[PDB]
C-alpha cells in the first residue's frame, strides 16, 4: 500500500500531501537538529519558537512558460516576512534554522517538461557591472518571497550605479560555473511525466553554529527548466510553480529591539 | 635524555625534545604554564566576600 509517490508532511498547524512524489532528499544525509552545548557559542538562553515558526509558509506562485529561464530564492530571506518566523528572525541578532522545502508543479499526462530543483549552500551570484567586482546592493540581493529570475543573456550596465544587481545567467548558474554540474548540490527533478513535487529537507549549513540571518543567507533555492515546458494544444500555456517552505529546529540568540532593514 | 610531550593542536600528536647544552639558559621556551590566580589583583581583601551576599554588611 505504501509508496515512494505518496507522502504527508506535518509541521506545526500545517500539512502537505502529495500523490506523485519521487522519494525525498535529506541534504548531505543529515536531518536538522538543535545546537548542542558542546558546539554552542552565544551564551544567552536561546528562544526556540517551535510550532509558532516551524511550519509551512507558501510563497507567491510563479508561472512556468515555454520561455521561462528559471527562478531563485535565498533562505532565510524568502521567509523574512512570514508570520512569527519573521518576527523571531528580526527581534534577534542571531538565528539558525533547517528547512523542509516543498516545490509543487502539476500538469497532465499530455504535458512535458523538467525542472531541476537545487539547494545551494552559500549561493553567491555575479554582479551586473564590469566597472566593479562583488557590487550588489542589499535590496537587490534580498528580494524576499518574490525571489528573482534567471536570464539567458548577460548585459552588464554602462554605469556602475545601474548594475548593482545579480547577473543571473542561467547556463553559468549566475556564478561562473556550468549549470549541468549543479547536481553536486542536494536536488530533485520535477519531470512532469513522473512527478508533481520535489521535497528537500535541509540541515543548517554554515561555518558557524549560528549567524546573523539579516546579514547572511545560508541557502539558495534554484529552479531551472532543464527541459522546456511543452503542450501541443497550446505552446503558450502556463502552469504554476508553488514553493512552500517550513523552518525547522529554529533557535535564536541576542534579543533586542526589532531589526528593520532598508527598503531602497 | 629525550622528552616526549603533547603538541599544541592544529587544524585537524606528540613531539620530542633533547637538550644539547650544559646550561639551562640555552634551552628552548618553557612549557605552557596555565597557572593563574586573578584574585590576588581582583579581590585582595582581608575578609572573604561572598558574591551573593552584600559587599558591606
Amino acid at each position: 500500500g505504501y509508496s515512494d509517490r505518496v507522502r504527508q508532511i506535518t509541521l506545526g498547524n500545517s500539512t502537505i500531501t502529495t500523490q506523485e512524489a519521487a522519494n525525498a532528499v535529506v541534504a548531505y544525509g543529515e536531518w536538522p537538529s538543535y545546537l548542542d552545548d558542546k558546539e554552542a557559542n552565544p551564551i544567552d538562553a536561546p528562544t526556540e519558537p517551535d510550532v509558532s515558526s516551524n511550519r509551512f509558509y507558501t510563497l507567491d506562485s510563479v508561472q512556468w512558460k515555454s520561455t521561462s529561464r528559471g527562478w531563485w530564492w535565498k533562505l532565510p530571506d524568502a521567509l523574512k516576512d512570514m508570520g512569527m518566523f519573521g518576527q523571531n528572525m528580526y527581534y534577534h541578532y542571531l538565528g539558525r534554522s533547517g528547512y523542509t522545502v516543498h516545490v509543487q508543479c502539476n500538469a497532465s499526462k499530455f504535458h512535458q517538461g523538467a525542472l531541476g530543483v537545487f539547494a545551494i549552500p552559500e549561493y553567491v551570484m555575479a554582479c551586473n557591472t564590469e566597472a566593479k567586482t562583488s557590487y550588489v546592493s542589499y535590496v537587490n540581493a534580498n528580494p524576499g518571497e518574490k525571489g528573482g529570475v534567471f536570464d539567458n543573456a548577460y548585459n552588464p550596465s554602462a554605469e556602475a550605479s545601474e548594475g548593482r544587481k545579480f547577473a543571473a545567467l542561467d547556463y553559468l548558474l549566475g556564478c561562473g560555473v556550468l549549470a549541468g554540474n549543479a547536481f553536486v548540490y542536494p536536488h530533485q527533478i520535477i519531470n512532469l511525466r513522473t512527478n508533481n513535487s520535489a521535497t528537500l529537507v535541509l540541515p543548517y549549513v554554515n561555518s558557524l553554529a549560528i549567524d546573523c540571518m539579516a546579514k547572511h543567507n545560508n541557502w539558495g533555492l534554484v529552479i531551472l527548466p532543464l527541459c522546456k515546458l511543452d503542450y501541443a494544444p497550446n505552446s503558450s500555456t502556463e502552469i504554476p510553480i508553488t514553493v512552500t517552505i517550513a523552518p525547522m529546529f529554529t533557535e535564536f540568540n541576542g534579543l533586542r529591539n526589532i531589526t528593520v532593514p532598508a527598503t531602497q | 635524555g629525550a622528552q616526549v610531550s603533547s603538541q599544541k593542536v592544529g587544524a585537524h600528536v606528540n613531539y620530542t625534545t633533547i637538550n644539547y647544552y650544559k646550561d639551562s639558559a640555552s634551552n628552548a621556551a618553557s612549557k605552557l604554564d596555565f597557572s593563574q590566580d586573578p584574585s590576588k589583583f581582583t579581590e585582595p581583601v582581608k575578609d572573604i566576600m561572598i558574591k551573593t551576599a552584600p559587599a558591606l554588611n
Binding site: 538562553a45 | 596555565f34 579581590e43 581583601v45 552584600p54 559587599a55
Partner: peptide, 27 residues
C-alpha cells in the same frame, strides 16, 4: 586547562543579589 564554561541557568527572585557590590573595598 580551559577558560570558563557557562552553566545552564534560569531566572531568580531572591534575596541573593550578586549584581550589587562595593568597589570601595578594592575588589
Amino acid at each position: 586547562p580551559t577558560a570558563q564554561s557557562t552553566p545552564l541557568t534560569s531566572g531568580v527572585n531572591s534575596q541573593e543579589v550578586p549584581a550589587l557590590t562595593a568597589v570601595e573595598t578594592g575588589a
